[PDB]
Amino acid sequence: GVTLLLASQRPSEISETIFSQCNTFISMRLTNPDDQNYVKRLLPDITNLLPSLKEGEALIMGDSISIPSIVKIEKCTIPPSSIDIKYLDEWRKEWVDSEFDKIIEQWSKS
Amino acid sequence: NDINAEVVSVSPNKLKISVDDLEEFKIAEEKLGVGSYLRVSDNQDVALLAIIDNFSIEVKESQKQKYMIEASPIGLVKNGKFYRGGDSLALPPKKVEPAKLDEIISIYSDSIDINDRFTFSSLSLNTKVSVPVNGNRFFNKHIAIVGSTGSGKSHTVAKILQKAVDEKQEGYKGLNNSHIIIFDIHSEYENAFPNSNVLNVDTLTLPYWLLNGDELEELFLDTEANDHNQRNVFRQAITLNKKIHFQGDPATKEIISFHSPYYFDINEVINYINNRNNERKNKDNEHIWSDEEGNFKFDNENAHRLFKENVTPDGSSAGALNGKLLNFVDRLQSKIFDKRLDFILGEGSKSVTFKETLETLISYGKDKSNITILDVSGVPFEVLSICVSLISRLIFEFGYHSKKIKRKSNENQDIPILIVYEEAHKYAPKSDLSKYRTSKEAIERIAKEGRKYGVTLLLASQRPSEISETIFSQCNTFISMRLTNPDDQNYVKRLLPDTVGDITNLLPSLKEGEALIMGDSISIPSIVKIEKCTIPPSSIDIKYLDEWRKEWVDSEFDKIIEQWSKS
Amino acid sequence: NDINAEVVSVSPNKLKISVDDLEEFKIAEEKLGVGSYLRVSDNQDVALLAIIDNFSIEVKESQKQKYMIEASPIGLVKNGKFYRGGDSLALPPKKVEPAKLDEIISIYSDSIDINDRFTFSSLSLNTKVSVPVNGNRFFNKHIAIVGSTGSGKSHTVAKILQKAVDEKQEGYKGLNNSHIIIFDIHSEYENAFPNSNVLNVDTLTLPYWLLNGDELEELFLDTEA
Amino acid sequence: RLDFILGEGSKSVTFKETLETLISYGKDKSNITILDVSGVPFEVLSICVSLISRLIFEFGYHSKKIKRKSNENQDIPILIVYEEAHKYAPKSDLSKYRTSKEAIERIAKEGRKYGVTLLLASQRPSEISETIFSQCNTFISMRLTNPDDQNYVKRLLPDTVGDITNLLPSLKEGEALIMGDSISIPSIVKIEKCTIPPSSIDIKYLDEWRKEWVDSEFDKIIEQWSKS
Ligand SMILES: Nc1ncnc2c1ncn2[C@@H]1O[C@H](COP(=O)(O)OP(=O)(O)O)[C@@H](O)[C@H]1O
Ligand SMILES: Nc1ncnc2c1ncn2[C@@H]1O[C@H](COP(=O)(O)OP(=O)(O)O)[C@@H](O)[C@H]1O
Ligand SMILES: [Mg+2]
Ligand SMILES: [Mg+2]
């Protein structure tokens, strides 16, 4: 009763012994052909749409699904706290006078 | 008319187009090249647009000229609005014209908002259209600028950073918020950025006590030896030496450990280890010494007395670490005594402060600048991996700790920091050798985790094929100036998402200064011309011909020898 | 006419040239080699300069000789000034002749300024074409001369250094400011530079105390035990 | 054999005339200093190469200290020529050549800004370490004949030529292939013929073997060996 969810990024660097034991496979957009070829090999030609996948789309394969298909994962109404930093919009403002006292206190703490 | 071309066959992502007449020859010269744009429709309101991948102009004896154009549909234009996507299908035949200036403008001006556009280049085939990128997505996802020597890589790097500095929100005057750090080995960005803070070996003081646990044992210990008694005596010396120099609250003093960023003096650390090469236990198994104040037993309270050299061992048997640390000590003072490491292990590191190192690294001191150029020309190459890893980790954990302050206040990470890695293959090679391991890991955490902490990369390397795959793939934005090595082109082709026909033969044949921008920052991967640097980079290289061409100098040689003796 | 060649196919970086008539055979041997330069134009003013990459000559009993030349457009010339270009289009058919001497010279001479030009070699397929290098940039960046034994790399090293020694600013008489140190191991560069300082074992005095700790260990210790 | 490094002369020589010897700034000036290291024993050859290569580098390192203090236009550029660079700077990390490896690799990495540049002339390029060979920018590739050296050079060349794989073993005598910053395009060149060629005094084994059995020379070898 102890299974695992392997939320990795690129399949080409994960240990073979764990990633071969996984059977249900969800592949999002994968821009590295080395990553694509590992996902292609697991299938017994839908992998050619892996790099052109839109944001949020996925390819689910395994015995859990009937056919390996490109799916759109449901949007998170309560999303995880993963906020992208707007580099341009932050850089447009004034030079913000940030005091270094409070930051290096906790850096020294841990 | 001037051009009579139509689509003869379509594919899922390929249009084959036959040019039938070609009355006007300058249509073929600039509007029918590889990477140009074609309008594919039967009307003048709804159309597809297509990049040109390949062409072939066959001519023979009696039959007609066979001009065939291979194109890929990049998107859809409806009533002056461009919509990306190859899903829309053109049923052949469809009349093909070169795209007008307004359609090519609408390609790049529709996918990006009016406030998210970052323009630093124009299209190479059409100068009148500028090519903006999504500057949030340009800089949040890491940038890789590759190319051969003389292709204009540093000019492209400089021109991006000037446009990052000169761009401002309206209603204010003065320095903007952008923070860019450059690792300058060839010393080129002084001439590009005159109004910026530059730090060379003679000026920059990097404290050695800010090195973490991994960096300290790489610089001092032997990874190949892997001696745990040498490892344990190093940590217990530095941890104790950080305690005796702390002047603060006792509760913070207990949490001080070997990785904690606190000041310790390396000369006393050598003295502690050198003394512990000469321990002599008594019959009760306790080490006994004698300084000027009297005999004492080596325990936790009196271990600070070994930091001074004037201690004499007093015992019968050999101590616990007697003779096990002599190769440790001789290499330990070999790096301290070296004059090349005065900026890192010298007397100047005693008088600097953890604040003063951060205030100097991102130019937050008395003189403030957006661009901090780290002239690591004079830095010796064996500590180049150490120094780059120290600064990169000092910016990443500043970027981490900046966010965790703002998560308490429920705010975003205020200042985003960019680090430019000129000649990035030296810090982060494909080779798994231990001499560049610490710089590989430091760029790894910025590449894979720094996106969420405000710390990013600009991997500007002449040889991308000597950068590791696990950091090159994290650079979503890719700029290709001119790549001529076959292994270099086969490397980038293996790390690039799609973009068939825009790299296969285009990269060797590119002009100086024009590049290939791609990623989620741009709407489509296009060959653009990076705009000229009015204030260009200029490395002050030794012009060997003119110095050899002149008279044999005689006054200089005497000054070189005596200055060597003086220092 | 001497040679009647013509472009029959155009690719983004590839050119197919059909040689229809070859009255002068000597153009084929010298000017239509593997690495030779062809100019591709319908006029003498503006031309597309292309290097050859491959060729094939077919003869059959009834048909005419099929001399095909496969070329690549390395650049472009305008009134004698060469521009290195990418995908500059030449619409077929275009008359092809061997490139003039002034055109091939302008590929190598125009990229380097006349003060920074350093010549130690000429083009293999055209001995009249001097090939200069940016001697400003030739020396400060490191040079790697590689070949097999008996390929002539000792001669190439010697010729470069002789060209770097006899050259001067012309405003003085005497020795220039070249400083070249050769780790001559085969005892061969004595002849190439007769007016040089040669240091063998009997003349060199290398102090042992200028050795560092790493060098001093190998001079005295044994490392096997 | 170690008299040049461990004799009575090495003690009395001071630091200044050592650099007057290696750079030829002594009594007789010379643009080219030829270091005949053939009679140097092979056990100490990497030691003497690394000693000189270090000494030239810190001469250029301390060259720049005056030029930032005095801001004078004059400068002393130095080029170092390493004939058979694959044995001074091998790919192997063995202890015997890491002194000469570290001296050359310091020049290959830091010597650009100090006026101490290097020329690598090796008949077996594949043994030279990639961290030194890639620091070079201009490559004069002569006739390369071993397939291992052909594959090594083709990777680290900054550019390529059409059909380079058959070009390298088919180069004629004096034919070269220059790529890099100095040249505009990779071109097949003919190096100028040396009027005063580099000639090594070689023993013509077959020529002396066909002569008569010499008799007088054997005794003069033994008596000098006996007396010295
Ligand atoms: N946008 C441009 N337009 C025209 N010339 C350029 C441009 N960018 C660079 N160059 C030229 O290319 C040359 C090479 O500079 P650079 O690309 O910085 O070298 P590297 O690729 O080694 O960094 C420079 O001398 C510069 O004049
Ligand atoms: N540029 C050249 N032109 C004509 N002959 C040459 C040229 N370079 C070398 N040679 C001849 O080829 C021979 C090869 O010698 P060299 O190339 O100097 O030896 P190595 O390559 O083994 O150092 C020499 O005897 C020389 O006469
Ligand atoms: Mg550069
Ligand atoms: Mg030789």
Coordinates of C-alpha atoms in Angstrom, one line a residue, chain B residues 151-535:
Chain B
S151 CA 30.1 36.6 -34.6
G152 CA 29.0 39.4 -32.3
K153 CA 28.0 37.5 -29.1
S154 CA 29.3 40.1 -26.7
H155 CA 27.6 42.9 -28.7
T156 CA 24.3 41.0 -28.5
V157 CA 24.8 40.5 -24.7
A158 CA 25.7 44.1 -24.2
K159 CA 22.8 45.5 -26.3
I160 CA 20.3 43.4 -24.4
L161 CA 21.6 44.8 -21.1
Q162 CA 21.6 48.4 -22.2
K163 CA 18.0 48.1 -23.3
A164 CA 17.2 46.6 -19.9
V165 CA 18.8 49.6 -18.2
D166 CA 17.6 52.4 -20.4
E167 CA 14.0 51.2 -20.3
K168 CA 12.0 52.9 -17.6
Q169 CA 8.5 53.5 -16.3
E170 CA 7.4 57.1 -16.9
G171 CA 7.1 59.7 -14.2
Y172 CA 10.5 59.2 -12.6
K173 CA 14.2 60.1 -13.2
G174 CA 17.2 58.1 -12.1
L175 CA 18.4 54.5 -11.9
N176 CA 15.9 51.7 -12.6
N177 CA 15.3 48.4 -10.8
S178 CA 17.3 46.0 -13.1
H179 CA 20.1 44.1 -11.5
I180 CA 22.6 42.4 -13.9
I181 CA 25.8 40.7 -12.9
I182 CA 28.4 39.9 -15.6
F183 CA 31.3 37.5 -15.2
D184 CA 33.8 39.2 -17.5
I185 CA 36.9 37.1 -18.3
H186 CA 38.0 39.0 -21.5
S187 CA 37.3 42.5 -19.9
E188 CA 35.0 43.8 -22.6
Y189 CA 32.1 45.5 -20.8
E190 CA 34.1 48.5 -19.4
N191 CA 33.8 50.2 -22.8
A192 CA 30.2 49.1 -23.1
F193 CA 29.1 50.3 -19.6
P194 CA 31.1 53.3 -18.5
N195 CA 28.6 54.3 -15.8
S196 CA 28.8 51.0 -13.9
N197 CA 30.7 49.4 -11.0
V198 CA 33.5 47.1 -12.1
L199 CA 35.4 44.8 -9.6
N200 CA 38.7 43.2 -10.5
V201 CA 41.2 41.3 -8.3
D202 CA 42.8 44.5 -7.2
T203 CA 39.4 45.9 -6.1
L204 CA 37.0 43.1 -5.2
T205 CA 37.5 41.4 -1.9
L206 CA 35.6 38.1 -1.6
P207 CA 35.6 36.8 2.0
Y208 CA 36.6 33.2 2.3
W209 CA 34.4 32.7 5.3
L210 CA 31.3 33.1 3.1
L211 CA 32.2 29.9 1.3
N212 CA 29.8 27.1 2.2
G213 CA 30.7 23.6 3.4
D214 CA 30.9 22.2 -0.1
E215 CA 33.1 25.1 -1.4
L216 CA 35.4 25.1 1.6
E217 CA 36.4 21.4 1.2
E218 CA 36.8 21.8 -2.6
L219 CA 39.2 24.7 -2.1
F220 CA 41.1 23.1 0.8
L221 CA 40.6 19.4 1.1
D222 CA 41.3 16.6 -1.4
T223 CA 38.1 15.1 -2.8
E224 CA 40.1 12.1 -4.2
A225 CA 41.7 11.3 -0.8
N226 CA 38.4 11.5 1.1
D227 CA 40.0 11.5 4.6
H228 CA 37.3 11.8 7.3
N229 CA 39.8 12.6 10.0
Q230 CA 41.0 15.5 7.9
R231 CA 37.4 16.4 7.2
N232 CA 36.4 16.3 10.8
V233 CA 39.3 18.4 12.0
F234 CA 38.6 21.1 9.4
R235 CA 34.9 21.5 10.4
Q236 CA 35.7 21.4 14.1
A237 CA 38.3 24.1 13.7
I238 CA 36.2 26.5 11.5
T239 CA 33.1 26.0 13.6
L240 CA 35.0 26.7 16.8
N241 CA 36.8 29.7 15.2
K242 CA 33.5 31.2 14.1
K243 CA 32.3 31.0 17.7
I244 CA 35.2 32.8 19.2
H245 CA 35.0 35.7 16.8
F246 CA 31.2 36.2 17.1
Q247 CA 30.2 39.3 19.1
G248 CA 26.5 38.8 19.6
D249 CA 23.6 37.1 21.3
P250 CA 24.5 33.7 22.8
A251 CA 21.4 32.0 21.4
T252 CA 22.6 32.8 17.8
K253 CA 26.1 31.6 18.8
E254 CA 24.9 28.0 19.5
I255 CA 23.4 27.7 16.0
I256 CA 26.7 28.6 14.4
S257 CA 28.0 25.6 12.5
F258 CA 30.4 24.8 9.7
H259 CA 28.2 26.0 6.8
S260 CA 26.9 29.1 8.6
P261 CA 28.2 32.4 7.1
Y262 CA 30.3 33.8 9.9
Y263 CA 33.8 35.2 10.0
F264 CA 36.7 32.9 11.0
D265 CA 40.5 33.5 10.6
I266 CA 42.1 30.9 8.4
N267 CA 45.6 31.4 9.9
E268 CA 44.3 30.2 13.3
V269 CA 42.5 27.4 11.6
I270 CA 45.8 26.2 10.1
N271 CA 47.4 26.7 13.5
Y272 CA 44.7 24.6 15.1
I273 CA 45.2 21.8 12.6
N274 CA 49.0 22.0 12.7
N275 CA 48.8 21.8 16.5
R276 CA 46.5 18.8 16.2
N277 CA 49.2 17.2 14.0
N278 CA 51.3 17.1 17.2
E279 CA 48.9 15.9 19.9
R280 CA 50.4 13.8 22.8
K281 CA 47.9 12.0 25.1
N282 CA 48.8 11.0 28.7
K283 CA 48.0 7.6 30.2
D284 CA 44.3 8.8 30.9
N285 CA 43.9 9.4 27.0
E286 CA 43.6 13.2 27.3
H287 CA 45.8 15.6 25.2
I288 CA 47.9 18.1 27.4
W289 CA 49.5 21.3 26.2
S290 CA 51.3 24.3 27.6
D291 CA 51.0 27.9 26.4
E292 CA 52.3 30.9 28.3
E293 CA 49.5 30.9 30.8
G294 CA 50.1 27.3 32.0
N295 CA 49.3 23.7 31.3
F296 CA 45.8 22.8 30.1
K297 CA 43.9 19.8 28.9
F298 CA 42.4 19.7 25.4
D299 CA 38.6 19.8 25.8
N300 CA 35.7 21.9 24.5
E301 CA 36.5 24.9 26.8
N302 CA 40.3 25.0 26.1
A303 CA 40.2 24.0 22.4
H304 CA 40.4 27.7 21.5
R305 CA 43.9 27.9 22.9
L306 CA 45.2 25.8 20.0
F307 CA 44.5 28.7 17.6
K308 CA 47.7 30.4 18.8
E309 CA 51.1 29.0 17.6
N310 CA 52.9 29.3 20.9
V311 CA 51.6 26.0 22.4
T312 CA 53.9 23.1 23.2
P313 CA 52.6 19.5 23.5
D314 CA 53.2 17.7 26.8
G315 CA 52.5 14.0 26.9
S316 CA 53.9 10.5 26.6
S317 CA 52.2 8.7 23.8
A318 CA 51.2 9.8 20.3
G319 CA 48.0 11.7 20.1
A320 CA 44.7 11.0 18.3
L321 CA 45.5 12.9 15.2
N322 CA 49.3 12.9 15.5
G323 CA 50.9 12.7 12.0
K324 CA 47.6 12.2 10.3
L325 CA 47.3 15.9 9.1
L326 CA 50.7 16.9 7.8
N327 CA 49.8 16.7 4.1
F328 CA 46.6 18.6 5.1
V329 CA 48.6 21.5 6.7
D330 CA 51.2 22.0 3.9
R331 CA 48.6 22.3 1.2
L332 CA 46.5 24.5 3.6
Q333 CA 49.2 27.2 3.8
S334 CA 50.2 26.7 0.2
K335 CA 47.0 28.4 -0.9
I336 CA 47.0 31.0 1.9
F337 CA 50.6 32.2 1.2
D338 CA 50.0 32.5 -2.6
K339 CA 49.8 36.1 -3.7
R340 CA 47.3 35.4 -6.5
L341 CA 44.6 34.6 -3.8
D342 CA 45.0 37.9 -1.8
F343 CA 41.6 39.0 -3.0
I344 CA 40.0 35.8 -1.4
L345 CA 42.4 34.7 1.3
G346 CA 44.2 37.9 2.1
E347 CA 44.2 40.5 4.9
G348 CA 41.4 42.4 3.1
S349 CA 38.9 39.6 3.9
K350 CA 39.2 40.3 7.6
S351 CA 37.8 43.9 7.4
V352 CA 34.8 43.2 5.1
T353 CA 31.2 42.5 6.2
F354 CA 28.5 40.1 4.9
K355 CA 26.5 43.2 4.1
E356 CA 29.5 44.8 2.4
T357 CA 29.9 41.8 0.1
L358 CA 26.2 41.8 -0.9
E359 CA 26.3 45.6 -1.3
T360 CA 29.3 45.3 -3.7
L361 CA 28.1 42.2 -5.6
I362 CA 24.7 43.7 -6.8
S363 CA 26.0 47.3 -6.6
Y364 CA 24.0 48.4 -3.6
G365 CA 26.9 50.3 -1.9
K366 CA 27.8 54.0 -2.0
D367 CA 27.8 54.0 -5.8
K368 CA 24.7 52.3 -7.3
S369 CA 24.5 50.8 -10.7
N370 CA 22.3 48.4 -12.6
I371 CA 25.3 46.5 -14.1
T372 CA 27.9 44.9 -11.9
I373 CA 30.8 43.7 -14.0
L374 CA 33.1 41.1 -12.3
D375 CA 36.4 41.3 -14.1
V376 CA 37.7 37.8 -13.4
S377 CA 40.5 38.2 -15.9
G378 CA 43.2 38.3 -13.2
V379 CA 41.5 35.5 -11.2
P380 CA 43.6 32.3 -11.4
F381 CA 41.8 29.5 -13.2
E382 CA 42.0 27.0 -10.4
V383 CA 39.8 29.3 -8.2
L384 CA 37.7 30.5 -11.1
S385 CA 35.3 27.6 -10.4
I386 CA 35.4 28.4 -6.7
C387 CA 34.8 32.2 -7.2
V388 CA 32.0 31.8 -9.7
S389 CA 30.3 29.2 -7.5
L390 CA 30.6 31.4 -4.4
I391 CA 29.1 34.5 -6.1
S392 CA 26.3 32.5 -7.9
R393 CA 25.3 30.7 -4.6
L394 CA 25.5 34.1 -2.8
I395 CA 23.0 35.4 -5.3
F396 CA 20.7 32.4 -5.3
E397 CA 20.4 32.2 -1.6
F398 CA 19.9 35.9 -1.5
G399 CA 17.2 35.3 -4.1
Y400 CA 15.7 32.5 -1.9
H401 CA 15.9 34.6 1.3
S402 CA 14.4 37.6 -0.5
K403 CA 11.4 35.6 -1.4
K404 CA 10.9 34.1 2.1
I405 CA 10.8 37.6 3.6
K406 CA 8.2 38.6 1.1
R407 CA 6.1 35.4 1.7
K408 CA 5.8 36.4 5.3
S409 CA 4.6 39.9 4.1
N410 CA 2.5 38.2 1.3
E411 CA 4.4 40.0 -1.4
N412 CA 6.4 39.1 -4.6
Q413 CA 10.2 38.9 -4.7
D414 CA 11.0 42.6 -5.2
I415 CA 14.4 42.7 -7.0
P416 CA 15.1 40.2 -9.8
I417 CA 18.8 39.5 -10.5
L418 CA 20.3 38.4 -13.8
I419 CA 23.7 36.8 -13.9
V420 CA 25.6 36.8 -17.3
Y421 CA 28.1 33.9 -17.7
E422 CA 30.6 34.8 -20.4
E423 CA 32.3 31.7 -21.7
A424 CA 30.0 29.6 -19.6
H425 CA 31.5 26.3 -20.8
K426 CA 34.5 26.8 -18.5
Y427 CA 32.4 27.1 -15.3
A428 CA 29.9 24.3 -16.3
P429 CA 31.4 21.7 -18.6
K430 CA 29.9 18.4 -19.9
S431 CA 32.8 16.7 -18.2
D432 CA 32.1 15.3 -14.7
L433 CA 35.5 16.3 -13.3
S434 CA 35.6 17.4 -9.7
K435 CA 37.6 20.6 -10.5
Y436 CA 34.5 22.3 -12.0
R437 CA 32.0 20.4 -9.9
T438 CA 31.2 23.3 -7.5
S439 CA 30.5 25.8 -10.3
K440 CA 28.4 23.2 -12.1
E441 CA 26.1 22.8 -9.1
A442 CA 25.9 26.5 -8.5
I443 CA 24.6 27.2 -12.0
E444 CA 22.4 24.1 -11.7
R445 CA 20.4 25.4 -8.8
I446 CA 19.9 28.8 -10.6
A447 CA 18.9 27.0 -13.8
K448 CA 16.5 24.5 -12.2
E449 CA 15.3 26.4 -9.1
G450 CA 16.3 30.1 -9.5
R451 CA 13.3 30.8 -11.8
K452 CA 11.1 31.1 -8.6
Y453 CA 13.5 33.2 -6.6
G454 CA 14.5 36.0 -9.0
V455 CA 17.9 34.7 -10.0
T456 CA 18.4 33.8 -13.7
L457 CA 21.2 33.1 -16.2
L458 CA 22.6 34.5 -19.5
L459 CA 24.8 31.7 -20.7
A460 CA 27.0 33.4 -23.3
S461 CA 29.4 30.8 -24.4
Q462 CA 31.5 30.4 -27.6
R463 CA 31.3 26.6 -27.4
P464 CA 27.9 25.4 -26.3
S465 CA 29.0 21.8 -27.0
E466 CA 31.2 22.1 -23.9
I467 CA 28.3 23.0 -21.7
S468 CA 26.3 20.3 -19.9
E469 CA 23.0 19.2 -21.3
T470 CA 21.3 19.5 -17.9
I471 CA 21.9 23.3 -17.7
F472 CA 21.6 24.1 -21.5
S473 CA 18.1 22.6 -21.6
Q474 CA 17.0 24.9 -18.8
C475 CA 17.8 27.9 -21.0
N476 CA 14.4 28.3 -22.7
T477 CA 15.4 31.5 -24.6
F478 CA 18.1 30.7 -27.2
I479 CA 20.1 33.2 -29.4
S480 CA 22.3 31.9 -32.2
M481 CA 24.7 34.4 -33.6
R482 CA 26.8 32.3 -36.0
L483 CA 27.8 28.7 -35.3
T484 CA 30.5 27.1 -37.5
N485 CA 31.7 24.0 -35.6
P486 CA 29.8 20.9 -36.8
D487 CA 29.8 19.5 -33.2
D488 CA 28.5 22.8 -32.0
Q489 CA 25.6 22.8 -34.5
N490 CA 24.8 19.1 -33.8
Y491 CA 24.8 20.0 -30.1
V492 CA 22.3 22.8 -30.4
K493 CA 20.1 20.9 -32.8
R494 CA 19.8 18.1 -30.2
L495 CA 18.8 20.7 -27.5
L496 CA 16.4 22.7 -29.6
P497 CA 12.6 22.4 -29.6
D498 CA 11.3 22.0 -33.2
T499 CA 12.4 24.9 -35.5
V500 CA 13.2 22.7 -38.5
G501 CA 14.5 24.6 -41.5
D502 CA 15.7 27.7 -39.6
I503 CA 18.9 26.2 -38.3
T504 CA 19.9 23.3 -40.7
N505 CA 22.0 25.5 -43.0
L506 CA 21.2 29.0 -41.7
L507 CA 23.7 29.1 -38.7
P508 CA 27.0 28.8 -40.7
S509 CA 25.8 31.4 -43.3
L510 CA 24.6 34.1 -40.9
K511 CA 26.1 37.6 -41.2
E512 CA 27.9 39.3 -38.4
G513 CA 25.6 40.7 -35.8
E514 CA 22.4 38.9 -36.9
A515 CA 21.0 36.1 -34.7
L516 CA 18.2 33.6 -34.2
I517 CA 15.8 34.4 -31.3
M518 CA 13.6 31.5 -30.2
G519 CA 11.6 30.3 -27.2
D520 CA 8.4 31.4 -25.5
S521 CA 9.7 34.9 -25.4
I522 CA 9.2 35.3 -29.1
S523 CA 6.1 34.4 -31.2
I524 CA 8.1 32.5 -33.8
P525 CA 11.8 31.6 -34.2
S526 CA 13.0 34.2 -36.7
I527 CA 16.4 35.4 -38.0
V528 CA 16.7 38.9 -36.6
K529 CA 19.5 41.6 -36.9
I530 CA 20.6 42.7 -33.5
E531 CA 20.8 46.5 -33.5
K532 CA 24.2 48.1 -33.4
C533 CA 25.9 49.1 -30.2
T534 CA 26.6 52.8 -30.2
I535 CA 28.7 52.2 -27.0

